Amino acid sequence: EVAYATFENMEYGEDFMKPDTETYNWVIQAYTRADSYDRVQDVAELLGMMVEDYKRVQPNVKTHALLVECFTKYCVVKEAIRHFRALKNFEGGTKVLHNAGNFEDPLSLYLRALCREGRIVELIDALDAM
Amino acid sequence: PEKDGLFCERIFGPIKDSRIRRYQMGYIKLTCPVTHVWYLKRLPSYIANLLDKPLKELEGLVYCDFSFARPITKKPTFLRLRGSFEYEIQSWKYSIPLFFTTQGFEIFRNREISTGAGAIREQLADLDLRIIIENSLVEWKQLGEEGPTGNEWEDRKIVRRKDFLVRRMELAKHFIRTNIEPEWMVLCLLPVLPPELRPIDINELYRRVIYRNNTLTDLLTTSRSTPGELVMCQEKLVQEAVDTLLDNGI
Amino acid sequence: AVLAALASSFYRHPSKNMAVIGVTGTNGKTTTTYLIKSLYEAMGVRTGMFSTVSCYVHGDNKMDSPTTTSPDAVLVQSMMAKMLHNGTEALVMEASPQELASGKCDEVDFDIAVFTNLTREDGTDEEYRDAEAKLFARMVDPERHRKVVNIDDPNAAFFVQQGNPDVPVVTFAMENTKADVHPLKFELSLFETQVLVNTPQGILEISSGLLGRHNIYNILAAVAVGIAVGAPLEDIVRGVEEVDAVPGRCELIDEEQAFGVIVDHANTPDGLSRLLDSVRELKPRRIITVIGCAGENERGKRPVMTKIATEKSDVTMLTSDNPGNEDPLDILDDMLSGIGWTMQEYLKHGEHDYYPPLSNGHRLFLHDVRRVAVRCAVAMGEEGDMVVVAGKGHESYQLEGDKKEFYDDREECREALQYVDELHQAGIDTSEFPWRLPESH
C-alpha cells in the first residue's frame, strides 16, 4: 500500500508524472514480495492497467520476471507460462528470474510448479531457456 | 471491592492513577474451552464451514452431550470409531478404562473420544488447511462435472454444496495468509470488561459465568468426582453463561 | 594409585572369609548367576549376589547400593564386609570384563570360575580374550578352588590354560558329548524347557521357565557348578527348578494364559536380532514385538531396529522407550525410515482404519504412548502366538522430558493379561490395531 499510494499519486497525475515501464515493475514487485494477505488480485489489476496503457508502456525483462514469480507463487500456472514464453524472448531470460536464488528463488518454483502440474512439455521448453 | 472480584483494586488498578480502571482489564480462566457463539450459532457458522460438518452435529456436540470420534489425526489412534456419536459407548465407560487403567486411559482419552467444545478446538487445531483447500477444490470440480440433473430439488442442493465448498476454501485461504489461528474461535480464556465501563447490567452476567465456572473447578479438583451427568451439567451451563454474555439474541 | 589395601584391611579380607564365585562371558551372565544363587540357596548356604539386575546380599532381601557401572574398588569391597558382617557364606557376581580389567576386583578371593561364552560382539580382539583370562589368572590355588568352562566356545582351551593348570575343571556343552555334562534330550516349548542332562554322577532331568537354547548354557553351567562343588543331584534340581523368571533377561511372565509373554532388555540391533531368532526356535505361531529407542542418544540405530523387527517378527509394535527431551513421534519417525515409511504416511492409513501389511506380509502397528502399547500388544496375541517386549527389561522408569515416571513392563503385561478376557467378552476385536468395537464402522 505504501508503494501503491505513490503509484496512484503519479498514475492519476500530470503527463510528466505518468508511470513508465520501470514504475510498473516496482509496484508489482511490492505486491509480489509481500509478507501479508493475498495480493494476486491486485497484481492482476495492476497488470490490467499496464496493458490498457499499451500506447505508452511496454513490458521489459523485469516485468515478466515478477509476473512469473507472482503467478507461480499463487499457484496460477497457465498465466505464468504465458509470461515465461515472453520472458524467453529476452537475452537475460531466466537469470533475471533467478534473482541470484534470493526471495525463495522463483525460477526453481516455475520448474517445480510445472513438474507437479504435469506440464512436462512446457518444462522442457523452460530448460531450453536455461 | 472484594479481593479477586469483578471490581478488585489489584486487578483493575487503584480505585482512587485511578484513570487506569477504564483501560486495565482482567481475564477468566475457564477449565473447559468454550466456543465463541459468533462463529457457532450465527448462521452461516464459520466453524461448520471450516469443519465441513453440518451445524446440527456441532450443536449436539456442545449442548446435547454428544461425543466425537477421531478428534485428532496428527497422533496415532487405535479405534474403528468414525465421527459424532449421539449415544454413549457402552464399552468406553467400564471396559476400556479398566483395561488401560484410569491414569493411562486419560492420557489418550481425548485422542480417541472428545466431548464438548474441547472436541471442536482440538479438531480445529488438527485441521490441515492446505489439505482442506485441495480436497474441497476437487470436490467442487467434481460436482460441476456432472452438470444438470433434470430435477429442481437436486439442482437446488448441488448449488448449496458448491457455494459451501467455495466459502470453505476461501476461509482456509485467509487463515494461512494471516496470523489468525482457527483455534481462537474456541476460547479458553474470557476477557473481562474494565469496571468503569460496567458500573453497578453485564456485571451479573460476569458474576454468573464466574461462579458457574468456579463450581466446575470443585467438580474436577476433588478426588474422583462423578463424571458425566454431573461434569456435563456444569459444563453446558458454563457454555450458556459465556453464550448469553457475548451474544444473547442468537 | 592401586591402594585398596585398607579396603581389604577394614574388611579384613572379607572376600577370603566367604566363598566367591565368578561368572564371566559375553552372553548369559545374569541368567547363570541367578541359577547359581538359587543352587547355593538350595544347599542351605547363605548366598551373596552382585549382578547388574540386582544386588541380593542374602536370600531374597534386596538393597540399593549405587549401581553406577562398576562401583569404586575400595567401595566394592565395602559391602563385601557388610554381607559378611550379616554372615553371608557364598558370593556370586557377573565378572564384567571392564570390572576386573580396571582392577575393581583386586583383593577378591574368587573360588569358582565360570566361563559362559565369548563372542566379542560387546574393541580389541585377542587382548579382550586375555582380559577375560585375568579372571582365570586369579586362579592360583590348584587343589581347593575349581574351574568351569564351556567347550562349545573355541576359546575354552585358551581359558583353561590360564591360571594354575592343576585346578580341577568341570566341562559342560551341548555338543562334544565328551563333556562332563551334556544334554541327552531337550525340548523347547513356549512356556518351559525340558532337558535331560548326563552328569558324571548320573542322569539328571530339569524343567524350568527359561526359554530358548541360549539359556541352556546357563542351565548346563548351573548343574556343572553343582558337580564342581559336589552338590547332590536332587538338590541341584531344586535350585534350577526354583528359578523361573530373571528380571529383564528373556523373562517369561505367565498368568495362566494360552500364549506366553516375554520381557527382555534387548535394545541394540545385535541383541534384538539374537533374541528374535532365539524365540523362533521355540516354534511359536506368531511373534509380536514391542521395541523402543532412547531419545537424543544412539540415534544411528533406530532404522536398524525396525528393519530387524519387521523381518523376524510377524507383528511389530514401535513405541517410545525413553523419549527424554526428544519428541516421541520424532523417534518413531526415525524408526519408520528403516522400512521407508513416514509418520505422516502411517497416520494417513489411520484415517482409512486399515494399516497395509509389509512387503513380506508382516504387520507394523506403532503407538507413541508406552502404557497403551504394551497392553495393546498383549491383547493382540492369539493361541500359540508370542509377545516379546524390548528396550526396558528390569528398568522400572519411563524417562519423559526430565522426569523419570515409574513404569514397569512386568506390571503392564501382568495387568493386560488379567483384563484381556473382559475386553473380548465385551465384543472388542483386538486382532489388528484398528480395534472393531460393537459400535464401529
Per-residue cell: B149: 440433473
Distances (CA, A) of C66 to C55, C72, C76, C96: 10, 10, 10, 16
Q: Give the separation between CA B215 and CA B221, rounded to whole angstroms.
A: 10
Per-residue cell: B247: 451474544
**Is the peptide bond preceding residue C284 cis, with omega within 30 degrees of 0?**
no
Alpha carbon dihedral C38, C40, C46, C48, in 10-degree steps, equals -70
Q: Give the separation between CA B243 and CA B209, rounded to whole angstroms.
A: 10
- Report yes or no: B29 at the A interface, CB cutoff 8 Å: no
Asked whether the beta carbons of B53 and B29 are under 8 A apart, the reply is no
Q: Which helix (H) or strand (E) holds A67?
A: helix A61-73
Q: Which of B177, B178, B179, B180 would you mutate first to test chain A, the one with the most A CBs within 10 A?
A: B177
- Report yes or no: A102 at the B interface, CB cutoff 8 Å: no
Query: What chain B residue is nearest to A37 in terms of C-alpha separation?
Result: B177
Q: Which chains touch C (3 or more CB pairs under 8 A)?
A: B
Distances (CA, A) of C53 to B195, C93, C202: 65, 11, 33
Query: What chain C residue is nearest to B103 in terms of C-alpha separation?
Result: C371
The verdict on a CB contact (< 8 Å) between B99 and C371 is no
- Report yes or no: B91 at the C interface, CB cutoff 8 Å: yes
Taking the CA atoms of chain C, what radius of gyration do you get in angstroms?
23
Q: Give the separation between CA C360 and CA C311, rounded to whole angstroms.
A: 8
Nearest to C335 by CA among C289, C288, C299: C299
Beta carbons within 10 angstroms of residue C176's beta carbon: 13
Q: Give the separation between CA B85 and CA B66, rounded to whole angstroms.
A: 6
User: Can you give the three-state secondary structure of chain C, one letter per residue?
Assistant: CCCCHHHHHHCCCHHHHCEEEEEECCCCCHHHHHHHHHHHHHCCCCEEECCCCCCCCECCECCCCCCCCCCCHHHHHHHHHHHHHHCCCEEEEECCHHHHHCCCCCCCCEEEEEECCCCCCCCCCHHHHHHHHHHHHCCCCCCCCEEEEECCCCCHHHHHHCCCCCCCEEEECCCCCCCCEEEEEEEECCCCEEEEEECCCCEEEEEECCCCHHHHHHHHHHHHHHHHCCCCHHHHHHHHHHCCCCCCCCEEECCCCCCCEEECCCCCHHHHHHHHHHHHCCCCCCEEEEECCECCCCHHHHHHHHHHHHHHCCEEEECCCECECCCHHHHHHHHHCCCCCCHHHHHHHHHCCCCCCCCCCCEECCCCCCHHHHHHHHHCCCCCCEEEECCCCCCCCEEECCEEECCCHHHHHHHHHHHHHHHHHCCCECCCCCCECCCCC
Per-residue cell: C381: 496375541
Nearest to C82 by CA among C58, C109, C101, C116: C58
Asked whether the beta carbons of C52 and C30 are under 8 A apart, the reply is yes
The verdict on a CB contact (< 8 Å) between C369 and B104 is yes
| Chain B positions in Cβ-Cβ contact with residue A38 (cut-off 8 Å) | 173-174, 177
Instruction: Answer left, alpha or beta for residue B199, where phi above 0 means left and psi between -120 and 50 means alpha.
Output: beta
Q: Which chains touch A (3 or more CB pairs under 8 A)?
A: B
Q: Give the separation between CA B121 and CA B51, rounded to whole angstroms.
A: 11
Asked whether the beta carbons of B101 and C412 are under 8 A apart, the reply is no
Q: Which helix (H) or strand (E) holds B28?
A: strand B27-35
Q: Give the separation between CA A27 and CA A50, rounded to whole angstroms.
A: 11
- Report yes or no: B107 at the C interface, CB cutoff 8 Å: yes
Which candidate from B76, B80, B95 shows the least CB-CB separation from C440? B80
Give C328's strand partners.
none
Buried b (16+ CB within 10 A) or exposed e, B22-35: eeeebebebebbbb
Nearest to C77 by CA among C37, C46, C104: C104
**Beta sheet of C169-172, edge-to-edge order:** C47-49, C90-94, C19-24, C110-115, C146-150, C169-172
Residue A125 to chain B, least CA–CA distance (Å):
28
Q: Give the separation between CA B188 and CA B121, rounded to whole angstroms.
A: 9
% helix, strand, coil for chain A, step of 5: 70, 0, 30
Residue B172 to chain A, least CA–CA distance (Å):
12
Q: Give the separation between CA B200 and CA C233, rounded to whole angstroms.
A: 95
Nearest to A101 by CA among A58, A79, A57, A69: A69
- Report yes or no: A37 at the B interface, CB cutoff 8 Å: yes
Asked whether the beta carbons of A49 and A11 are under 8 A apart, the reply is yes
Residue C80 to chain B, least CA–CA distance (Å):
42
Query: What chain B residue is nearest to C418 in terms of C-alpha separation?
Result: B99
Q: Which of C290, C331, C353 would you mutate first to test chain B, the one with the most B CBs within 10 A?
A: C353
| Chain B positions in Cβ-Cβ contact with residue C329 (cut-off 8 Å) | 75
What is the residue type of C70? S
Task: Give contacts of B 51-70 with C, CB under 8 A.
Answer: 70
Chain centroid, CA B236 distance in Å = 11
The verdict on a CB contact (< 8 Å) between B78 and C416 is no
What is the residue type of C212? G
- Report yes or no: B223 at the C interface, CB cutoff 8 Å: no
Sequence-distant (≥ 6) Cβ neighbours of residue A52 within 8 angstroms: none
- Report yes or no: B104 at the C interface, CB cutoff 8 Å: yes
Q: Which of A38, A41, A42 would you mutate first to test chain B, the one with the most B CBs within 10 A?
A: A38
The verdict on a CB contact (< 8 Å) between C371 and B76 is no
Query: Interior CA angle at A95 toward A93 and A97, to 5°?
Result: 80
- Report yes or no: B160 at the C interface, CB cutoff 8 Å: no
Residue C353 to chain B, least CA–CA distance (Å):
6
The verdict on a CB contact (< 8 Å) between B101 and C441 is no
Question: What ranges in chain B are assigned the alpha helix state H?
Answer: 9-12, 46-51, 55-63, 91-94, 96-100, 102-112, 117-126, 129-146, 152-176, 202-221, 233-246
What is the residue type of C20? V
Q: Which chains touch B (3 or more CB pairs under 8 A)?
A: A, C
Give C404's strand partners.
C399
Q: Is the dihedral angle over the CA atoms C410, C412, C415, C420 positive or is it negative? A: negative
Residue C265 to chain B, least CA–CA distance (Å):
23
The verdict on a CB contact (< 8 Å) between A38 and B177 is yes
Experimental method, per PDB record: cryo-EM
**Do chain A and chain C touch with ≥3 beta carbon pairs under 8 Å?**
no
Chain centroid, CA A33 distance in Å = 11
Beta carbons within 10 angstroms of residue B152's beta carbon: 7
- Report yes or no: B160 at the A interface, CB cutoff 8 Å: no
Query: What chain C residue is nearest to B84 in terms of C-alpha separation?
Result: C440
Residue C331 to chain B, least CA–CA distance (Å):
13
| Chain B positions in Cβ-Cβ contact with residue C415 (cut-off 8 Å) | 101
Q: Is the dihedral angle over the CA atoms C148, C152, C157, C162 positive or is it negative? A: negative
Read out DSSP for A76-99? --HHHHHHHHHHHTSSSTHHHHHG
**Do chain B and chain A touch with ≥3 beta carbon pairs under 8 Å?**
yes
- Report yes or no: A35 at the B interface, CB cutoff 8 Å: no
Q: Give the separation between CA A18 and CA B30, rounded to whole angstroms.
A: 59
**Beta sheet of C386-389, edge-to-edge order:** C251-253, C261-263, C386-389, C287-291, C315-318, C363-364
- Report yes or no: B103 at the A interface, CB cutoff 8 Å: no
Nearest to C31 by CA among C224, C236, C271, C220: C220
Q: Give the separation between CA C144 and CA A28, rounded to whole angstroms.
A: 97
Q: Give the separation between CA A59 and CA A40, rounded to whole angstroms.
A: 19
**Do chain C and chain B touch with ≥3 beta carbon pairs under 8 Å?**
yes
